[PDB]
């Protein structure tokens, strides 16, 4: 299983490498006009600061999701022990009235 896992990793790297080489072959036509040039970085300052605020929002969203999932987990275990207590109480009550 360890040898086959190593073979699967090796196959994944070989596939990724073959795909990188296919991309170069498809992009040979794009390389042909590499002598061309145009305008760039006109409004880059606000675009970069807004991209940084967006990365802060995505990282905060990731933290928010982690805190959400762990809370759903503890809440589920709390609801589960509460349901176990409810049934134990109800059955003990049914047994007291039966007695």
């Amino acid at each position: 299983q360890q040898d086959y896992e190593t073979a699967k990793h090796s196959q994944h790297q070989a596939k990724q490498q073959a795909f990188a080489l296919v991309e170069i072959v498809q992009r040979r036509v794009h390389f042909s006009y590499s002598d061309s040039a145009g305008m760039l970085s006109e409004n880059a300052d606000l675009n970069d600061k807004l991209r940084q605020r967006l990365e802060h929002a995505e990282s905060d969203r990731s933290r928010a999701r982690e805190q959400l999932r762990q809370q759903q987990a503890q809440y589920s275990q709390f609801n589960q022990v509460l349901a176990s207590l409810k049934s134990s109480y109800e059955t003990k009550q049914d047994m007291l009235k039966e007695l």
């Binding site: 086959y4 073979a7 080489l21 999701r65 509460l82 009550q93």
Partner: protein, 148 residues
């Protein structure tokens, strides 16, 4: 009479345990709902920032002029220079490298399948061995595989 009294005391204790768990579940439910509204608010904030970024760049990136397009070919070639152990890799000799790496990829699939045949018979043989071991443990209890 004493049994009915003990069951009443057990019901009182279970009521105290129920009160403690209901309080814990209500607090946990409030925290769960607050974290849901907050998380949805974080995705809404992320989407608002993405939409405002799109609206701000509209006039900047539309006039691309097909001149900033070849850098992607250069980046693809550079990505391949780190991923593939070929520092001399050129768009010209990349066809010989492509067929050479495709040969390694099919060899890797053939080797993977060759290992997979033996792996499948080995995994199923271990599953029957484990079934025989579980059957012995259910009938007598803990014992070694040598004694099975």
């Amino acid at each position: 009479q004493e049994k009915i009294d003990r069951y009443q005391v057990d019901l009182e204790e279970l009521s105290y345990r129920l009160e403690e768990q209901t309080d814990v579940v209500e607090e946990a439910g409030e925290l769960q709902a607050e974290y849901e509204a907050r998380t949805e608010a974080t995705e809404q904030e992320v989407d608002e920032l993405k939409s405002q970024l799109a609206d701000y760049q509209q006039a900047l990136d539309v006039q691309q002029t097909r001149a900033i397009q070849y850098q992607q070919a250069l980046q693809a070639l550079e990505r391949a220079r780190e991923l593939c152990r070929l520092p001399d890799l050129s768009v010209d000799n990349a066809e010989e490298w492509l067929e050479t790496f495709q040969a390694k990829e099919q060899q890797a699939t053939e080797a993977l399948l060759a290992l997979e045949q033996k792996l499948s018979v080995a995994d199923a043989a271990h599953n029957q061995f484990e079934q025989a071991y579980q059957l012995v443990k259910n009938i007598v209890g803990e014992t070694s595989r040598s004694e099975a």
